[PDB]
Amino acid sequence: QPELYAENSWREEMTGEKGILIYPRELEVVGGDDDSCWLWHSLILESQGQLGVEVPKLMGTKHVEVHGRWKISDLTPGLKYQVLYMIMVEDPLEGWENCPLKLRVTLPDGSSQTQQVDLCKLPKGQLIMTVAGYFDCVGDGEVIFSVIETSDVVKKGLVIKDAVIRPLPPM
Amino acid sequence: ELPKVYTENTWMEERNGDRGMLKYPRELDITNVDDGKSWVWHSLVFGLGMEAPKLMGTTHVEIRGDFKMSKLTPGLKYQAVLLCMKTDGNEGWDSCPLNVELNLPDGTTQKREVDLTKFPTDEFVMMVLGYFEAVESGDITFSVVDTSDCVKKGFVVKDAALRPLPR
Numbered sequence: 122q123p124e125l126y127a128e129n130s131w132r133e134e135m136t137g138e139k140g141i142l143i144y145p146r147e148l149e150v151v152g153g154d155d156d157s158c159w160l161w162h163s164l165i166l167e168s169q170g171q172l173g174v175e176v177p178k179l180m181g182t183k184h185v186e187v188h189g190r191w192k193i194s195d196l197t198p199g200l201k202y203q204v205l206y207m208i209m210v211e212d213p214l215e216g217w218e219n220c221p222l223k224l225r226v227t228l229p230d231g232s233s234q235t236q237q238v239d240l241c242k243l244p245k246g247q248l249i250m251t252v253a254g255y256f257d258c259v260g261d262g263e264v265i266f267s268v269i270e271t272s273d274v275v276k277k278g279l280v281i282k283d284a285v286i287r288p289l290p291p292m
Numbered sequence: 293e294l295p296k297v298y299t300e301n302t303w304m305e306e307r308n309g310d311r312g313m314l315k316y317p318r319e320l321d322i323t324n325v326d327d328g329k330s331w332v333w334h335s336l337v338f339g340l341g342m343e344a345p346k347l348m349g350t351t352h353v354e355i356r357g358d359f360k361m362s363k364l365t366p367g368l369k370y371q372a373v374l375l376c377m378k379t380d381g382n383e384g385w386d387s388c389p390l391n392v393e394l395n396l397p398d399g400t401t402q403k404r405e406v407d408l409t410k411f412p413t414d415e416f417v418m419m420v421l422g423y424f425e426a427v428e429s430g431d432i433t434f435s436v437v438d439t440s441d442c443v444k445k446g447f448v449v450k451d452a453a454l455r456p457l458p459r
């Protein structure tokens with residue numbers, strides 16, 4: 122089939138604002154090239170075929186660290202934006218008890234906000250929308266959005282689908 | 293070849309359990325998509341690819357889809373959207389708006405005309421199908437249609453989604 126290359130983004134129809142999707146191959150996955158840490162999979166939806174996304178599955182490491190970034194000046198000014206990490210957990214799951222996955226958003230001013238998500242309570246296999254944080258689209262520099270867990274325990278079973286940077290528009 | 297992770301076309305908000313869903317082009321009903329002329333299936337590649345159809349030239353544009361309310365979150369307010377793109381070299385859209393309908397289980401229908409010449413070129417747009425509050429059961433259907441005399445060209449369909457209002 123002929124290939125069509127496109128920007129991984131969208132514009133809201135009536136109001137114009139730009140949202141961003143970032144596939145995991147474009148994130149900074151620490152240990153991403155080590156199969157004993159992350160093993161890369163093809164994402165399948167049966168009724169459609171392959172969704173065209175390579176996703177990492179955590180295989181047994183103590184160091185979970187994934188980073189994305191985006192220039193705030195590339196987004197729509199004055200809007201409040203919301204960063205999401207889309208994830209899934211699958212058997213076997215291990216190591217996450219009382220070590221919630223940390224979601225962080227860092228701004229150009231060095232300020233940062235962190236949320237925590239208890240992977241042990243998530244229903245396995247369901248695609249999960251997690252909220253990493255919020256920011257107003259002003260100024261420039263890069264916003265950094267991460268998932269982190271570096272506690273001294275071997276972890277398994279986390280799958281990262283993608284990161285999303287989405288405006289909160291009026292309607 | 294890589295090992296696989298299987299998914300379903302729903303998602304859930306970690307923070308409260310609210311659900312959304314989407315459907316990909318092979319899950320939609322696109323008239324004449326296999327006629328070998330009106331639509332050509334492309335490999336849509338971001339940054340592997342997904343199978344997405346591009347409109348290459350026809351007067352008959354008819355895209356339909358459906359969703360089950362039971363998979364949504366009762367009481368929650370939704371936005372229904374079609375992710376699609378007007379590509380460089382598009383034709384026919386000056387005189388022919390697309391006619392868009394969202395049909396809800398309560399018998400109502402939201403209708404609008406969509407002038408595609410106002411879409412940006414070569415980037416995806418969340419075309420608004422409509423808005424609704426989800427109930428416990430019933431069928432949701434939508435259509436994006438024009439069959440007028442203008443030969444329409446340069447339009448990619450990516451996916452249809454039912455999402456809780458962004459917040």
Ligand SMILES: O=C(/C=C/c1ccc(O)cc1)CC/C=C/c1ccc(O)cc1
Nearest residue numbers: 207282283285287303375451453455458
């Ligand atoms: O604001 C939202 C945008 C959804 C969306 C769905 C399909 C697209 O083409 C572009 C955006 C809803 C919350 C995020 C849903 C989502 C589902 C799967 C995925 O991989 C990424 C996000």
